[PDB]
Amino acid sequence: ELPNYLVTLPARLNFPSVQKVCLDLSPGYSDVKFTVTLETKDKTQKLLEYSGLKKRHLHCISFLVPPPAGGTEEVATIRVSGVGNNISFEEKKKVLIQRQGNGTFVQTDKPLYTPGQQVYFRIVTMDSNFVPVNDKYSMVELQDPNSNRIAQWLEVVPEQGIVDLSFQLAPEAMLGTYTVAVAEGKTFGTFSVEEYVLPKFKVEVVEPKELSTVQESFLVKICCRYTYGKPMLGAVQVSVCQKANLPDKCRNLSGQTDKTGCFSAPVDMATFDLIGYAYSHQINIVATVVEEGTGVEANATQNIYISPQMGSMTFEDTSNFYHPNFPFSGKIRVRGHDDSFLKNHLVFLVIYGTNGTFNQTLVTDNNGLAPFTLETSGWNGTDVSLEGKFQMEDLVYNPEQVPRYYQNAYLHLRPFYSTTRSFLGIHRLNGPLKCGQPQEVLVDYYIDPADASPDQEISFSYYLIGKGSLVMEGQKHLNSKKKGLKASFSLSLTFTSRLAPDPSLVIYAIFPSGGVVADKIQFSVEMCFDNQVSLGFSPSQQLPGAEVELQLQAAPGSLCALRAVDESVLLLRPDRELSNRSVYGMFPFWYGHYPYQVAEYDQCTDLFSFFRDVGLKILSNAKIKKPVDCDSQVRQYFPETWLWDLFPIGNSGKEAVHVTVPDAITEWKAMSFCTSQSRGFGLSPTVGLTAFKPFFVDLTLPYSVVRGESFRLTATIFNYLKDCIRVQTDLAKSHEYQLESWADSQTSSCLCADDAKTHHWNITAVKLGHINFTISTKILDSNEPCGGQKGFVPQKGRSDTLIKPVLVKPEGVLVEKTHSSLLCPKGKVASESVSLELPVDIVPDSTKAYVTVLGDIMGTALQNLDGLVQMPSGCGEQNMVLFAPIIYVLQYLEKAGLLTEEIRSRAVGFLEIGYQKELMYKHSNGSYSAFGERDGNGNTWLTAFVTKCFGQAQKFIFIDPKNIQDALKWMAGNQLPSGCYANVGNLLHTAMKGGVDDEVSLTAYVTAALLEMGKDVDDPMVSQGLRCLKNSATSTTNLYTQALLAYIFSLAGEMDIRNILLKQLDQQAIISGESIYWSQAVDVELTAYALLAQLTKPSLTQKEIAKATSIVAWLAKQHNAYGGFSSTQDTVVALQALAKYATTAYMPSEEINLVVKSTENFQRTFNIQSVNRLVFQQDTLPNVPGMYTLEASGQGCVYVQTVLRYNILP
């Protein structure tokens, strides 16, 4: 009757991927040519050109999207056009072509390292379809806790999408959180270096998992297990505390575990006041287990929110909309107070509508599901509401009784836009669907006979849509000779990696009258990977020192990356999560609606809303859019990382290699992820291999022992054979250590089944470094039966020998002498002698000394200065705190040579769009105001601040003159020689106003703000300020005012009254290494203004340059005062101090050949280019402490710091 088209394409186009475009025809046509073209900025390509048929036919194809014109984002138009018989359909819509973000992660082999170990890390980058990419990382950097780049890798290539890089830490690497940052972006991975010892057991809460307010008492089961799965006996101390927003009430439980290793005790509600409004409903169970003999302890903390929820139901599988005059279906998940599956609970159901309120009573099943089917014949196309409750009566809660309530299920249903009386309904598929299994979808339909047109075939077009893109399609054809009967057909679907975790299915049918009948559901698929990889072991538990078979099952042509780590590492620090939820979560939230760039809105629930809720553009002339009204072994091993490997996968898809178990009785958590270019990414579940021995030895020893004390060694012997035995242990005696005559290191003891016994020694360490401790156990034959039975001897593994290292550090208090130098040749050779001297009362073998060369001041945060320009602001005080740092950032960058034209152009565009937003904030008195025209008189601090900003902003963008002169005249009018300052304004932000900002510092700040753009001394508006401030320096009050007075007399051109208060300023400088600083946040302001004062005089000596580098080395470590706009004026003074420092003395490195020499002619040569000048280079000094000469040649300055650490006796 009326022929019509329908064109489907996704909303968000993604450049590295292919997409789908689809066209649906009608009977008729057959001479009108439909072509669809994507008009982008530079060109226009056609998608598909096709002609109509005598039936409906869903014709669709893939395509490659053109690149965006802007580089990362472009709004393109899509246009369908059909020509023929002198008529031409044309219709255009807006789509968005953006470059999608490639998800990058990095993992390490451990989350925790000792000093002296090796850090391996893998960097993987993915598309949104989890296919790996081989783009070039520009720079991988590895950074200290002091934000010093200790390693970098330039232009690194991934193989098969993954790259693995290694770093050997120094054995005196300083502790803390080290960072791996990738490709100069927000992708980082942290790891801690600290002094630890591996724990052998895990304590966990078991029975309190969720708690209810209505229960009377609850059992606490604290249960603790070894890493190899065996229980122990140990003293348990549990604190069960309720906190408050005031003493906190706790109940403390003391106990001993049993043969199952679990400890249970009841706790009553009378301990905790669960009725108090001022008391929190979060209870804290902190358990501490000290196991018997050795005295080593472990913790287990769990914060439980006690629940006032008594019963919760939600509409689990129920559509959001109903068809008029057709039955509605849904099903409700009903849960109790503990989210349990209720046994046949009585669930009431009340509706809300214009016809009235109806009631229904239903009984759930064993799984708590409530299938309900409702008759919608009388609702008559109205917005209805559904409420699933526990009782008909409104719920009454008593303040005297405990808080308890029921979560009633609430839902709002809208009528579907029905211009026809036909029906679609898809039965939902319950819980989380298995990925890759072919699911059967059973859809019911009812075709109206008056809208049937039974002389032609009726077609059903379906799209299965995942992550905002068309995945699979079809058009089921069936005869209209059935006419009107309640029928059902089926669809065979398959969910894969391209499908969402919650993909959607849209089914419609178009009648020749023009009507559409449709239904859309959302599925629920588990987080799936197309590369189905399984990592397995056989026999999956074996004695240590033996070979297991390791099996990868991935797609053929994959590169697998395998990590097998000890569980004892994971008991200290939990590693960063590499699970399927984490990999899916870094691609943000899937494509729910149209973007704001290409959003369509009504100019004033249907199939257009169906394709909007999946984020797909529809173009159709049908009735789509609704009208809108508005035997022995030695156990030496490496118990930190067992396996860290890359494995190619052949054509079989299975790789089985033999790997040897390390000699630690523990559990190895193993995991693997594989990358294939055809199939994509796959992630194995974490499996475990239990390395276990029947009876064995275990040392209890700390990490570091200082030399010459006595420490308690505790060797525990475990027996897990099922009968009583007799052991004989012996500790090896060597010259590395001494013992205090504890039974001559030979004891024999009868130890029974499932039991541990601990021998103690107290040991003096005598030789420095890593020393060994060897102890062995043998089961000897019993001449007499101990315990009533003869001592059991096994057939295999009758002896166990264990060797464990101990780090030994020298005794005495550690003192350090640090010495700084700035070697800056300017075309010459610059040399400097450094003497290493020490008193003669040292402990021997304590003198460590290392030199450090660093080519550039400050580490990562110069790239954070690029991040300071973004997020534009034009409302409130958000603009004035952000317009100011930009000119100082580019002032520092153009004086350091790191300014590029792209960030310059983007920054001056930001200066234009912020410069035009400072004119409506201008006060009516010719001043400046935070509100704009309201604030009273002009604020002296804010007008001084904007004369500071626009006095330096004319060298980048055009600034009008007249604001400077009328602001100058208002400084002349608002200041008197009798009375200066007169602050009448305030900042909009709370608890931060800038500096200390009293009256004398405000006068000093405004008088500093008057000069240094075009002005000098003895002007009329600075003469009254210096008359106010000549006697202000005589007062010698405060520290911020003192440093700012030292700065404002540095710009006055005098050298007599400014150096006299620097003598009382440098003596109170607190010293941290070779980085001296002051503190009265505010400390950065004091150091920046003191640095700005010290580099103002034209005569500069090398002691002042060394003092300036000492200030700058403290300013280099700050990365929150600059790099973020959290402070209104700390960033501007810090960057102008660093910019004036780079003006005066320090140009950064370009090429320095440095060489150090000693008395033993130890010639050590450092080469510093312009590409590794941020790499913190260092080297130890093997020569006995004395003379060291330092000579550098080339262009640039280098910072050379010599640190000598040694220990002395008090």
Ligand X SMILES: *[C@@H]1O[C@H](CO)[C@@H](O[C@@H]2O[C@H](CO)[C@@H](O)[C@H](O)[C@H]2NC(C)=O)[C@H](O)[C@H]1NC(C)=O
Ligand Y SMILES: *[C@@H]1O[C@H](CO)[C@@H](O)[C@H](O)[C@H]1NC(C)=O
Between residues 740 and 841, which has the closer beta carbon with respect to ligand Y? 740
Q: Compute the least distance from the CB of residue 739 to ligand Y, in Å.
A: 9
Q: Compute the least distance from the CB of residue 62 to ligand X, in Å.
A: 15
Cα distances from 261 to residues 205, 231, 291, 485, in angstroms, run 12, 5, 11, 66
Sign of CA dihedral 464, 470, 471, 474: positive
Stretch that binds ligand X, among 94-102, 265-273, 361-369, 1004-1012 (CB under 6 A): 94-102
Of residues 753-782, those binding ligand X (CB under 6 A): 770, 772
Q: Is 246 exposed, middle or buried (0-12, 13-18, 19+ CB in 10 A)?
A: exposed
Binding residues for ligand X, rule CB under 6 A, total 11
Stretch that binds ligand X, among 96-104, 257-265, 510-518, 944-952 (CB under 6 A): 96-104
Cα distances from 886 to residues 548, 889, 906, 988, in angstroms, run 60, 5, 11, 21
Query: Could you write out the DSSP letters of every residue in 583-595?
Result: HHHTS-S---S--
The entry of ligand X, ligand Y, none that residue 848 binds, CB within 5 to 8 Å by partner kind: none
Position of tokens 């099903």? 331
Q: Does 184 bind ligand X (CB under 6 A)?
A: no
Between residues 16 and 308, which has the closer beta carbon with respect to ligand X? 16
Q: Compute the least distance from the CB of residue 1120 to ligand X, in Å.
A: 28
The entry of ligand Y, ligand X, none that residue 762 binds, CB within 5 to 8 Å by partner kind: ligand Y
Between residues 621 and 710, which has the closer beta carbon with respect to ligand Y? 710
Of residues 939-968, those binding ligand X (CB under 6 A): none
Between residues 576 and 798, which has the closer beta carbon with respect to ligand Y? 576
Q: How far is it, in rounded angstroms, from Cα 859 to Cα 501?
A: 41
Q: Compute the least distance from the CB of residue 496 to ligand Y, in Å.
A: 13
Helices 962-974 and 940-950, axial angle in degrees (round to 10): 150
The entry of ligand X, ligand Y, none that residue 133 binds, CB within 5 to 8 Å by partner kind: ligand X
Q: Does 588 bind ligand X (CB under 6 A)?
A: no
Query: Which of 53, 133, 250, 957 forms a contact with ligand X (CB under 6 A)?
Result: 133
Strands (E), 393-486: 405-407, 409-415, 423-426, 438-446, 458-466, 469-478
Query: Which of 102, 212, 239, 1172 forms a contact with ligand X (CB under 6 A)?
Result: 102
Q: How far is it, in rounded angstroms, from Cα 1161 to Cα 92?
A: 80
Stretch that binds ligand X, among 97-105, 897-905, 1009-1017, 1044-1052 (CB under 6 A): 97-105
Stretch that binds ligand X, among 98-106, 588-596, 912-920, 1016-1024 (CB under 6 A): 98-106
Question: Which DSSP helix (H) or strand (E) runs through 928?
Answer: none
Q: How far is it, in rounded angstroms, from Cα 368 to Cα 335?
A: 7
The entry of ligand Y, ligand X, none that residue 16 binds, CB within 5 to 8 Å by partner kind: ligand X
Q: How far is it, in rounded angstroms, from Cα 1204 to Cα 851?
A: 9
Between residues 11 and 289, which has the closer beta carbon with respect to ligand Y? 289
Is 141:189 a contact under the CB 8 Å cutoff? Answer: no
Question: Which DSSP helix (H) or strand (E) runs through 78?
Answer: strand 73-84
Q: Compute the least distance from the CB of residue 526 to ligand Y, in Å.
A: 4
CA 802 from chain centre, in angstroms, equals 40
Position of tokens 């109806």? 358
Between residues 216 and 740, which has the closer beta carbon with respect to ligand Y? 740
Between residues 43 and 581, which has the closer beta carbon with respect to ligand Y? 581
Q: Compute the least distance from the CB of residue 200 to ligand Y, in Å.
A: 12
Pairing of strands 405-407, 309-318: parallel
Start-to-end CA distance of the chain, whole Å, equals: 104
Position of tokens 């405060």? 1038
Q: Compute the least distance from the CB of residue 321 to ligand X, in Å.
A: 37
Per-residue binder mask for ligand X (CB under 6 A), 611-650, x = binder = -------------------------x--------------
Stretch that binds ligand X, among 95-103, 929-937, 1004-1012, 1120-1128 (CB under 6 A): 95-103
Per-residue binder mask for ligand X (CB under 6 A), 281-300, x = binder = --------------------
Between residues 587 and 742, which has the closer beta carbon with respect to ligand Y? 742
Q: Is 620 exposed, middle or buried (0-12, 13-18, 19+ CB in 10 A)?
A: buried
Position of tokens 């029975």? 207
Q: How far is it, in rounded angstroms, from Cα 104 to Cα 294?
A: 45
Q: Compute the least distance from the CB of residue 864 to ligand X, in Å.
A: 20
Q: How far is it, in rounded angstroms, from Cα 761 to Cα 716?
A: 11
Is 898:1139 a contact under the CB 8 Å cutoff? Answer: no
Between residues 198 and 1061, which has the closer beta carbon with respect to ligand X? 198
Q: Compute the least distance from the CB of residue 772 to ligand X, in Å.
A: 4
Q: Compute the least distance from the CB of residue 581 to ligand Y, in Å.
A: 5
Of residues 2-61, those binding ligand X (CB under 6 A): 16
Which residues lie below 8 Å from residue 886, measured CB to CB, with a gap of 6+?
868, 869, 907, 910, 911, 914
Is 218:238 a contact under the CB 8 Å cutoff? Answer: no
Q: What backbone phi and psi angles, to 5 degrees, belong to 1040? A: -70, -40
The entry of ligand X, ligand Y, none that residue 770 binds, CB within 5 to 8 Å by partner kind: ligand X
Between residues 501 and 855, which has the closer beta carbon with respect to ligand Y? 501
Position of tokens 């009608």? 26
Position of tokens 């200041």? 975
Residue 1124: closest CA among 885, 901, 772: 885
By CB under 6 A, name the binding residues for ligand Y. Answer: 299, 526-527, 580-581, 710, 740, 742, 762
Q: Across-strand partners of 801? A: 634, 776
The entry of ligand X, ligand Y, none that residue 527 binds, CB within 5 to 8 Å by partner kind: ligand Y
Q: How far is it, in rounded angstroms, from Cα 966 to Cα 985?
A: 18
Residue 941: closest CA among 888, 1005, 877: 1005
Q: How far is it, in rounded angstroms, from Cα 615 to Cα 753?
A: 66
At residue 899, the 3 state secondary structure works out as: coil
Q: Compute the least distance from the CB of residue 295 to ligand Y, in Å.
A: 13
The entry of ligand Y, ligand X, none that residue 99 binds, CB within 5 to 8 Å by partner kind: ligand X
The entry of ligand X, ligand Y, none that residue 740 binds, CB within 5 to 8 Å by partner kind: ligand Y
Query: Which of 185, 432, 702, 805 forms a contact with ligand X (CB under 6 A)?
Result: 805
Q: With the CA atoms of 21, 27, 28 and 32 taken in that order, what torsion angle do they form, in degrees rounded to the nearest 10?
A: 10
Between residues 327 and 436, which has the closer beta carbon with respect to ligand Y? 436
Between residues 16 and 694, which has the closer beta carbon with respect to ligand X? 16
The entry of ligand X, ligand Y, none that residue 581 binds, CB within 5 to 8 Å by partner kind: ligand Y
Between residues 740 and 1056, which has the closer beta carbon with respect to ligand Y? 740
Between residues 138 and 748, which has the closer beta carbon with respect to ligand X? 138
Residue type, 171: P
Between residues 297 and 655, which has the closer beta carbon with respect to ligand Y? 297
Between residues 41 and 1030, which has the closer beta carbon with respect to ligand X? 41
Q: How far is it, in rounded angstroms, from Cα 438 to Cα 434?
A: 9
Q: Compute the least distance from the CB of residue 636 to ligand X, in Å.
A: 6
Q: Does 99 bind ligand X (CB under 6 A)?
A: yes
Q: Compute the least distance from the CB of residue 1125 to ligand Y, in Å.
A: 37
**Which residue numbers in the chain precede an interruption (C–N > 2.5 Å)?**
245, 604, 630, 1080
Q: Compute the least distance from the CB of residue 562 to ligand Y, in Å.
A: 17
The entry of ligand X, ligand Y, none that residue 526 binds, CB within 5 to 8 Å by partner kind: ligand Y
Question: Which DSSP helix (H) or strand (E) runs through 500?
Answer: none
* Contact residues for ligand X, defined by CB under 6 A: 16, 99, 101-102, 133, 135, 636, 770, 772, 803, 805
